[PDB]
Design a protein around this ligand. Structure first.
Ligand SMILES: *[C@@H]1O[C@H](CO)[C@@H](O)[C@H](O)[C@H]1NC(C)=O
Ligand SMILES: *[C@@H]1O[C@H](CO)[C@@H](O)[C@H](O)[C@H]1NC(C)=O
Lengths: 439, 104, 49
């Protein structure tokens, strides 16, 4: 038959299911997803890197007046400073004094670090999901990869299956995303061509190997002093060379629900929220006949020691009496408890044990073994520790849940006085019976 | 403080640590010495203590309804002898015994 | 696991105490003490011969 199952999106718990094909044996199957990731859309907006100022040598215009032809360069800047006086070994470079001017000019550019070490401002919208899953299928720990969307079908080993779509469309990424060589940050970058000076976002290129870049470096050329023949220029602090401190943290440590974010490509594995429906389909070639399965009688279950922990804190012991020798599937029909055994081999009048667990204090419970109901109860204990390093499995529970003598207590204390209120109703009707016979 | 979801804690360049809560310190049991509410102290401490408080409230409302029936019962057992001027009702108050059964 | 108990201060009497963790089988434990040596604190006032 076709069987559709649903599993909550958590890694590290063997979820179980029962495929009930009437006229055939139950099929207790196991699924366990090992990794579930998101592939957000790739659209790089702009690379950004560390600039370098390109400063030509000064032009000492000796007692003439120089000017600069306004060449089109990114943050080209110029000034002709009058009254300059340079010094060398023979003091002044030239002879005259009055019209002694200095043509000064500089511009900015990329660096060689842009060839290798940069950041990418990036646009990423809604994503796909891909996962890998192990099924314990009849003594086979099979494992299949599939990109989960509801739209990819994969069949192996007489099992056809469609995984996805996810129920939660949540994604750890916003629109803006900046990547550096091993980390990501969900930060709104300023748009390309609109870079604020000083702060990160100024010096920009679309491709890593452009010959044109956009900049905003506020470059001012100040006045040189006497003899100090150099280029007195305003420094341009770029966001990269001090970017190291204001990172806060990467998204590895700011994420909700514990996603692990690995770059190249930027996958977000184990984004654990929501649930996924799976469709599995399987014909008769693994199905077992009802009458050819060994039916059982004399169902005698009991629990020697249950402890409602996160490990297998209950070992239930059950003695039975079968019909013949063969495999037999076992299944929990309520969600209070969970079992760790798919099927067991049974020969006849024999005994087995199982490793179950639950969350609450005291519960009665009916197991199915090969379409045979068996009820047994248990009273449990809490563990003495407080912290473990793995999530449990049964601990999804409700609030109206069965217990020990607690419900006998709540049946005690609601004894009622409404019967004696009805006795007061009887005294008022036996006094009103004089004239209470018209309306 | 490890939340009911669970804690992640990273220290240095080590691979991080993953912690989770469990059942409590559990100074508790189930008996005529109760120790029941301490079991309450792992299924949501300070949540559905509102349930046991409103449960105390509905039982005090039930006995308040018992006060209501008792005042209606005393008033409606005074109703057959409001001041019926015979001064002697033995088969009313001897059969009744609400208040002051010496008044014949 | 962790157990606290009280034995009476007698010498040469065997005693047993039940330890019971949950889950596993409980154990009974045998102990018996042999001496309770009182070591008071000393300080010399003087000697005499
Ligand atoms: C190493 O450098 C090359 C070229 O500079 C670059 O394409 C590549 O992504 C870099 N890889 C890492 C792991 O830094
Ligand atoms: C499948 O893997 C789990 C991992 O713990 C193991 O316990 C189980 O015995 C394996 N079963 C088979 C048939 O390999």
């Amino acid at each position: 038959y076709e069987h559709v199952t649903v599993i909550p999106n958590t890694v590290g718990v063997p979820y179980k299911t029962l495929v009930n094909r009437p006229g055939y044996s139950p099929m207790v199957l196991e699924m366990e997803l090992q990794s579930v990731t998101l592939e957000p859309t790739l659209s790089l907006d702009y690379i950004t890197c560390e600039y370098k100022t390109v400063i030509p040598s000064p032009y000492v215009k000796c007692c003439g007046t120089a000017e600069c032809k306004d060449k089109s360069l990114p943050d080209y800047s110029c000034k002709v400073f009058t009254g300059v006086y340079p010094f060398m070994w023979g003091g002044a470079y030239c002879f005259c004094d009055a019209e002694n001017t200095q043509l000064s000019e500089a511009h900015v550019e990329k660096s060689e670090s842009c060839k290798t070490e940069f950041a990418s401002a990036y646009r990423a919208h809604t994503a796909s999901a891909s996962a890998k899953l192990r099924v314990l299928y009849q003594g086979n720990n099979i494992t299949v990869a599939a990109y989960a969307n509801g739209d990819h079908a994969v069949t192996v080993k007489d099992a056809k299956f469609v995984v996805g779509p996810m129920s939660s469309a949540w994604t750890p990424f916003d629109n803006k995303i900046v990547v550096y060589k091993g980390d990501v940050y969900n930060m709104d970058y300023p748009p390309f061509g609109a870079g604020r000076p000083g702060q990160f976002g100024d010096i920009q290129s679309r491709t890593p190997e452009s010959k044109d870049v956009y900049a905003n470096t506020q470059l001012v050329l100040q006045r040189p002093a006497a003899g100090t023949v150099h280029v007195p220029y305003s420094q341009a602090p770029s966001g990269f060379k001090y970017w190291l401190k204001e990172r806060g943290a990467s998204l590895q440590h700011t994420a909700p629900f514990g996603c692990q974010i690995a770059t190249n490509p930027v996958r977000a594995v184990n984004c654990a929220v929501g649930n996924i429906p799976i469709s599995i389909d399987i014909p008769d070639a693994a199905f077992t006949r009802v009458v050819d399965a060994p039916s059982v009688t004399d169902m005698s279950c009991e629990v020697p020691a249950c402890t409602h922990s996160s490990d297998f804190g209950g070992v239930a012991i059950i003695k039975y009496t079968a019909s013949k020798k063969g495999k037999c599937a076992v299944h929990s029909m309520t969600n209070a408890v969970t079992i760790r055994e798919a099927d067991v081999e049974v020969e006849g009048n024999s005994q087995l044990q199982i490793s179950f667990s639950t969350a609450l204090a005291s519960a009665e419970f009916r197991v199915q073994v090969c379409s045979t109901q068996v009820h047994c109860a248990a009273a449990c204990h809490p563990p003495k520790d407080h912290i473990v390093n793995y999530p449990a499995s049964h601990t999804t529970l409700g609030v109206q849940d069965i217990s020990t003598t607690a419900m006998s207590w709540v049946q005690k204390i609601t004894g009622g006085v409404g019967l004696i209120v009805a006795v007061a109703a009887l005294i008022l009707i036996v006094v009103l019976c004089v004239s209470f016979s018209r309306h | 403080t490890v939340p009911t979801e669970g804690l992640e804690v990273t220290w240095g360049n080590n691979e991080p640590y993953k912690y989770w809560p469990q059942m409590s310190t559990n100074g508790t049991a189930h008996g005529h010495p109760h120790e029941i509410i301490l079991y309450y102290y792992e299924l949501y401490p300070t949540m559905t203590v509102v349930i046991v408080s409103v449960a105390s409230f509905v039982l005090l409302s039930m006995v308040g309804t018992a006060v209501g029936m008792c005042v209606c019962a005393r008033r409606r057992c005074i109703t057959p002898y409001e001041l019926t001027p015979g001064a002697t009702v033995p088969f009313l108050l001897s059969l009744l015994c609400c208040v002051r059964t010496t008044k014949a």
